[PDB]
Amino acid sequence: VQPDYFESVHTTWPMPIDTSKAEGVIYPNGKSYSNITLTYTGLYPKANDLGKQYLFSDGHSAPGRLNNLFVSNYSSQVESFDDGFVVRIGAAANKTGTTVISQSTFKPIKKIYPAFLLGHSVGNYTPSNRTGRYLNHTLVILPDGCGTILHAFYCVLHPRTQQNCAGETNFKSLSLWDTPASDCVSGSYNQEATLGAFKVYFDLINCTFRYNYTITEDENAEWFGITQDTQGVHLYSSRKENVFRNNMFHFATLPVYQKILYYTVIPRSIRSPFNDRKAWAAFYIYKLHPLTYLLNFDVE
């Protein structure tokens, strides 16, 4: 943990919302329009909202060897949900750049899918006296399988009292890892490495559901979104066409009915080697607000 190294003035590229390109807009469900203009009331971002930036990094790496992870304190930033949010995923994954760690090593910037914990109730970690512990049924959103699987489950999380493992006296954070070299050999994608590394930290007790979703990965623009209402939790994604990737469409409802109040982005460090590493992109989170928008639909 050294969070002044990650959110420094190295990359820090600001990315506001451009409504003239309709960034972060959720499409209406059950219906379509063609070649018209109308007003629509819904949950939308504010125009020119800068949002919040998350910079990720490969961990500490010895020559030829793997060490402890280089994460921020994102596991101790508990944020207010309030209406849900949308995430711009890796817009800088088409140019050159470092992640943040190897300042003299530009590597081709891959995309990083975010991981989330979401809950109604929050507390201290006992005996570490650290805040940020979810204590009842918590919702877990995990990307897996080199970005081909989305796990979503709703369980009680029991901290484990091993070497630190998010439940000892000494407690850095929860932090997740993956290996592009061994876990991401083509032909055999190991789609449980993030799940297993998460299960090192926690016992999953009394899971009400366990859903798995197919994720479409490429290196173009990506938008993810989450809202809650009285029918449950809704998940939104940009489709797979390279044809108007700013439009988000509903792809999942989850039977979660108690009100989500808090969320936590999970700090990651994908444990590539030292010489042949991959540089990492950012992602950007923007909050939704009840707003009226004027929308334009083409004939498609």
């Binding site: 469900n29 379509s32 329009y33 063609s34 004939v299």
Partner: protein, 193 residues
């Protein structure tokens, strides 16, 4: 909405809240009522079309078991430096004292406190057949597919022999009256309408 229109028509979604409930406390569930039930236990939401049903479940039908008591909450508040601050239900939501109230109640007017929060419960025995309440709400027009009851299902028909005449239609639960004409594709075809 009327109950007989739920029996002959289709809707986008159906939502059912249910619990055990004595029928002789029915007037405490009315909109406009003032007691502890609406304040601390359940407040009905009216933004969608909705129904409220009370019912008795008879002896040998179903595999529903009986609890020992009926039970509701009489108070929920937080203590402050000035005094009590009563926390009231939002429409459709759960009470903020729900985690305290999961500890159970053994006697009438038994309290449970954690930090600022305090809650008080009221129990009384179940006598005779069990009684229940159901809060039902429907949605129209928010989905490409429908929820339909089985008596409202008809087989299938075609339009290709009845173009350019006025017909009734029932298309994936969307019903009405209209004239149809073969055209060129516009709009997203995954959204169907």
């Amino acid at each position: 909405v009327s109950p007989s229109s739920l029996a002959t028509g289709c809707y986008s979604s159906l939502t059912v809240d249910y619990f055990a409930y004595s029928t002789d406390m029915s007037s405490y569930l009315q909109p406009g009522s003032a007691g502890a039930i609406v304040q601390f236990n359940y407040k009905q939401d009216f933004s969608n079309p909705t129904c409220r049903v009370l019912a008795t479940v008879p002896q040998n039908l179903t595999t529903i078991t009986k609890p020992s008591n009926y039970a509701y909450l009489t108070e929920c508040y937080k203590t402050s430096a000035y005094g009590k601050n009563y926390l009231y239900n939002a429409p459709g939501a759960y009470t903020p004292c729900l985690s305290l109230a999961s500890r159970g109640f053994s006697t009438k007017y038994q309290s449970h406190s954690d930090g600022e929060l305090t809650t008080t419960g009221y129990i009384y025995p179940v006598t005779g057949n069990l009684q229940m309440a159901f809060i039902i709400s429907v949605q129209y027009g928010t989905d490409t597919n429908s929820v339909c009851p089985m008596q409202a299902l008809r087989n299938d028909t075609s339009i290709e022999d009845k173009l350019d005449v006025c017909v009734e239609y029932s298309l994936h639960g969307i019903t009405g009256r209209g004239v149809f004409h073969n055209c060129t594709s516009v709009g997203l075809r995954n959204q169907r309408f």
